[PDB]
């Protein structure tokens, strides 16, 4: 079970920044079907990375397998990553992204074990 007063932040994780199956080509509708937009409201989110990998291996970064960063974790070795970054369009359904798959470290905020947000950087 995820506590209750951390499963919002982290379904919403899980939904902006959780997909093994993502590619560069795929920016745009994955944008579009997960609903992702820039805080409430429809403006065009300018910037958002998914993590290739399951969610329970992400979740090791804040258990067993991450490092202290500042406030945040920070994984102990690279993670496959998609981002996608806004071209143009200023909202919703206007949006348009171009994507980069690559590889970093990643850094996650971390509620009682659970990932609840994402670094960009």
Known sequence: KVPPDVD???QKFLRQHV???????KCDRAMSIKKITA???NDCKEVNTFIQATKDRITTVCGDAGTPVNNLFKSNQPFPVV???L??????????YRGTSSTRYIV???????PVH???G
């Open 8 to 10: 919002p932040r982290y």
């Open 19 to 25: 997909d093994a199956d993502m590619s560069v080509q």
């Open 39 to 41: 805080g409430t409201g």
């Open 83 to 85: 981002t996608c970054k």
């Open 87 to 96: 071209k143009s369009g200023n909202r919703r359904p206007n949006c348009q």
């Open 108 to 114: 996650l905020g971390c509620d009682k074990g659970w």
């Open 118 to 120: 994402y670094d960009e």
